[PDB]
Amino acid sequence: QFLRPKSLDEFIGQENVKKKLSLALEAAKMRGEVLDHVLLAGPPGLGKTTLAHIIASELQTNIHVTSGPVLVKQGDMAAILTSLERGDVLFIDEIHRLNKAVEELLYSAIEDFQIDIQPFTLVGATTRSGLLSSPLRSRFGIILELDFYTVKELKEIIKRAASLMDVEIEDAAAEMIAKRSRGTPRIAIRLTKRVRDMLTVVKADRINTDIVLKTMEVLNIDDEGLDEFDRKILKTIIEIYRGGPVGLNALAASLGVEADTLSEVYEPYLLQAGFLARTPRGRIVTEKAYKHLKYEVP
Ligand SMILES: Nc1ncnc2c1ncn2[C@@H]1O[C@H](COP(=O)(O)OP(=O)(O)O)[C@@H](O)[C@H]1O
Ligand SMILES: [Co+2]
């Protein structure tokens, strides 16, 4: 947790999100008012959880962490709501996974602020804002959509991480890791830790391009940052479905994984990076995919 930003000033990137959040945060603090409800949406590892904690820290209130699938019976939701103190942040990750039972209960605590519930700030996190119910989504006065980070931003996050792990790194090497981080801070930091391991075993004074390449080879990460499963998705569409189009459920069944893990975790960067495309009839692979994986373009 020593690598987790403790404030917006330590949060690299997401300029648009930061200015919007900072505005609402500073104003609330100055007026001593409870912050309006906030919804954080975007792929995993982009900092949603980090922002939820920063919000509570700046308001100088307590944060209550929970998950949608964890809150099944109304009893679990009631207990949490009644433990909230004025101004507290109720952070619900995977909020779109709330069942109608606890959902309707949470919905009520937002309007009438009674189940007697102390005014609080609801901070929800989801991979896609479109997953939340129409009713609940209209309750958030602040919606922050996080998109993938730029290579420059990731490079900065990597250099910051290395410094915190007591390891030197050359700019060129940091650039190389960032280019292979699939636009995600979580991925970039994990790769940096693994490259640190290589530097340790090879007894180097600082992380260079050579050390990075050696590590990428051990981790099976290619020049585009794609890992084994990313390649598996693309290769399955290419070989089994002749390039597509193939439906999400069909592709998921062939891969032996939940459709959610596919469309919420892996597909986002593949679409953003131009390896995959979505059509009404299903997912399709692009020419860039065939060329990158060295497949004869049909
Ligand atoms: N802007 C950022 N600067 C530095 N590290 C970041 C940033 N955003 C995310 N991270 C890092 O990445 C990891 C992932 O973040 P997290 O907030 O848990 O993601 P999410 O809830 O979106 O899955 C955290 O370790 C965190 O400290
Ligand atoms: Co479908």
Spot the catalytic one: 186, 193, 232, 235: 186
Which atom belonging to ligand 1 lies closest to the Cα atom of 53? 17
Q: Do the domains spanning 1-149 and 150-224 agree at the CATH topology level?
A: no
Q: Which two tokens stand for residue 217?
A: 């080879």
Using the mean position of ligand 2's atoms as its centre, give its distance from the Cα of residue 118 in Å: 42
Architecture category of domain 225-297 in CATH? Orthogonal Bundle (1.10)
Q: Which residue intervals of the chain are DSSP H helices?
A: 15-31, 48-59, 74-83, 100-111, 134-137, 151-164, 171-179, 185-202, 209-219, 228-240, 248-255, 259-260, 267-272, 287-292
Angle at 218 between CA 217 and CA 224, to 5 degrees: 40
Distance separating alpha carbons of residues 233 and 173, to the nearest angstrom: 28
Distance separating alpha carbons of residues 144 and 11, to the nearest angstrom: 15
Which atom belonging to ligand 1 lies closest to the Cα atom of 44? 23
The question of whether 186 is a catalytic residue gets the answer: yes
In three-state secondary structure terms, 274 is coil
Q: Which two tokens stand for residue 25?
A: 């945060």
In the chain, where the domains are located: 1-149, 150-224, 225-297
Residue 124 phi, psi dihedral angles, 5° rounding:
-105, 150
**What was the experiment behind these coordinates?**
X-ray
Spot the catalytic one: 61, 121, 126, 127: 127
Q: Cα separations (Å) of 234 from 144, 258, 294?
A: 30, 16, 12
Residue 148 phi, psi dihedral angles, 5° rounding:
-55, 150
Give which of 256, 247, 169 is closest to 211, Cα–Cα: 169
Architecture category of domain 1-149 in CATH? 3-Layer(aba) Sandwich (3.40)
Q: Ligand 1: which residues within 6 Å by Cβ? A: 3-5, 11-14, 44-50, 125, 157, 185-186, 189
The question of whether 49 is a catalytic residue gets the answer: yes
Best CATH choice for the domain 150-224 from the list 3.30.70.1520, 3.40.50.620, 1.10.940.10, 1.10.8.60 = 1.10.8.60
